[PDB]
Amino acid sequence: SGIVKMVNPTSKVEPCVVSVTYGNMTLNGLWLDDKVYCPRHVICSASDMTNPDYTNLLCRVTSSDFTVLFDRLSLTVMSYQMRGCMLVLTVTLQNSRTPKYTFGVVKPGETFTVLAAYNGKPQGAFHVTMRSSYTIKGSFLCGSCGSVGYVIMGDCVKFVYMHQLELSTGCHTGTDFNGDFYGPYKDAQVVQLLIQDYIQSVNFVAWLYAAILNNCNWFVQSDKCSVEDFNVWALSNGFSQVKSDLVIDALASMTGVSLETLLAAIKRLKNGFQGRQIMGSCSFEDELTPSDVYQQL
Amino acid sequence: SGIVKMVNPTSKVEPCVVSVTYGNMTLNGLWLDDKVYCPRHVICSASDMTNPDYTNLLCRVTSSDFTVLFDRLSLTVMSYQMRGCMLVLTVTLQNSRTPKYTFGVVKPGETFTVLAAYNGKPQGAFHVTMRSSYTIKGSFLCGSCGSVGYVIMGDCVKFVYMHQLELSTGCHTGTDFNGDFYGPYKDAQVVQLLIQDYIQSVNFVAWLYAAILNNCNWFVQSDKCSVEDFNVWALSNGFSQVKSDLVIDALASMTGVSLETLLAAIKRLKNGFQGRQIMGSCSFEDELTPSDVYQQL
Ligand SMILES: *C(=N)[C@H]1CN(c2ccc(C(F)(F)F)nc2)C(=O)N1c1cncc2ccccc12
Numbered sequence A, B: 001s002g003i004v005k006m007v008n009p010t011s012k013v014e015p016c017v018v019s020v021t022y023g024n025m026t027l028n029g030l031w032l033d034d035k036v037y038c039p040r041h042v043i044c045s046a047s048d049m050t051n052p053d054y055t056n057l058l059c060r061v062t063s064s065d066f067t068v069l070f071d072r073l074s075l076t077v078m079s080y081q082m083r084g085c086m087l088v089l090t091v092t093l094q095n096s097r098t099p100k101y102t103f104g105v106v107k108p109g110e111t112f113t114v115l116a117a118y119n120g121k122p123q124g125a126f127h128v129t130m131r132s133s134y135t136i137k138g139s140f141l142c143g144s145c146g147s148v149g150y151v152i153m154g155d156c157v158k159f160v161y162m163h164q165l166e167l168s169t170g171c172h173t174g175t176d177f178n179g180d181f182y183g184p185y186k187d188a189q190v191v192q193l194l195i196q197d198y199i200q201s202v203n204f205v206a207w208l209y210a211a212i213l214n215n216c217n218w219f220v221q222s223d224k225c226s227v228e229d230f231n232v233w234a235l236s237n238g239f240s241q242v243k244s245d246l247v248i249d250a251l252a253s254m255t256g257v258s259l260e261t262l263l264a265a266i267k268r269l270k271n272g273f274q275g276r277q278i279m280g281s282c283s284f285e286d287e288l289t290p291s292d293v294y295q296q297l
């Protein structure tokens, strides 16, 4: 028993972290097969930052200007391409330790592991949840750009995130491996306000199902609220729309508690917990998906 | 900016996880050099559990009864010894991937990474804080015993924990690598109540220092409380004793805020936050050490 925010082990991703250097700027990259992915803002001088013309910048750049470094092993660039807001660098050496990988995209509420790295050296890992603001609440410093976010599907690493920007204090965003930014965010030094965020409803239902299986069920009552009626209320109460997951149905069977019983509980809890905790908390814990709690039950 | 509970990367510890099997019971072990460490309760039958006589049990056990399995590679036992509540099994094969390791012990408030494993296969990792109850709030299921907790010191893995028991819902404990249990806990199927826990004061001071550097300082006032006077108050208010750390002094210089200013704030916050959050929370966040927050600043 017990519920925590868990990360995937990091041994499949650690051998792919490289250092990428251009002029007086060093950030991180991902070395997969004969290619190195990294944020394109590595070619930005502190003068060309407010509205950078990346096509003009890539004219005065050659493969030789790029210094890719796996640990202390120098890698040689053959060519480079701009795929959205991401640079793809073809190297001469194949990454022998390339895992079985796929390039995916997370939706709000979904979770992944970030392998934080500085100077191509992994420092540690942390669990994040993509918010409805298309940002993550991470912990990143000066040289953290290019750190990747991933999810292990069986024996496959689904790479879903590349660290690019800090929009505000503790508010982070980046691109998918197609070079596309999550949300409307851009790689420019301008004021970037956040997209509207909500409490991730199905993730809070997951916390309640896990609480029931962790000997905590005070919130379960006679009351019942249909998915359709809860969705109408959620629009004006800071909650996201609920879509019944296959894992939600599995959790409902294990507890004998219908999803509709839990949606009614959420509405009551909106006006207060009244000093009662649910697994050590009086908050809307919405950072774990139904399948994140299922794996711990 | 941003503060999260981070784990150490897991690539140095993953190659040491083995499966340990005795009869109809399978748990996890740590394979370091030519030795395999695992909980001694692997030799307990469901009849001899309330008050097990382990010396009597080890008479009817031979090296051949032990089945150590790294992935699908079978390891052969030469001999076995009981070191406290831990079994040490000498194998014929050296672990070629043994990291630079040391055996240590955590004190309450200190943090480490747990690499959760089932059947000798690592499932994931999570950050824990040793509580004053000499337990951790982990997430473990049926076959999780033998999962290790560790801390990376430079290039060295300090192994500090071996999962042994679930005392209560979401309340976990185990031994150090000398086979000694944290707290007064025993490996017997009896009711085991928890040692008194407290709010880890220096860890909450660490959260406040990090909050100041994360543009949140509403709690800083004119008020000042000495270490000595705060320690007297803490005795009857659920807070642990404060010892000024070298990292606390470093954090005090970076902010210009003395430790004594923060101890006074803690006393005011004891009677309420009044709807004001400190980095998204209205609780005594005491799970990160001063040096855990220092690494993220
Ligand atoms: C990542 N290493 C740095 C650099 N960076 C950045 C963003 C935008 C631009 C440009 F040119 F406008 F497109 N250039 C550089 C950025 O935001 N960084 C970053 C990322 N995460 C966290 C932090 C914390 C502190 C300072 C910089 C951070």
Ligand SMILES: *C(=N)[C@H]1CN(c2ccc(C(F)(F)F)nc2)C(=O)N1c1cncc2ccccc12
Pocket (backbone or CB within 6 Å): A001, B027, B041, B044, B048, B049, B050, B052, B140, B141, B142, B143, B144, B145, B146, B164, B165, B166, B172, B186, B187, B188, B189, B190
């Ligand atoms: C760990 N794999 C299991 C087994 N276990 C256990 C504790 C004590 C004893 C004995 F004989 F009294 F000494 N035998 C077996 C135990 O507590 N386990 C455990 C550990 N963590 C979590 C869980 C969750 C569910 C069930 C068992 C758990």
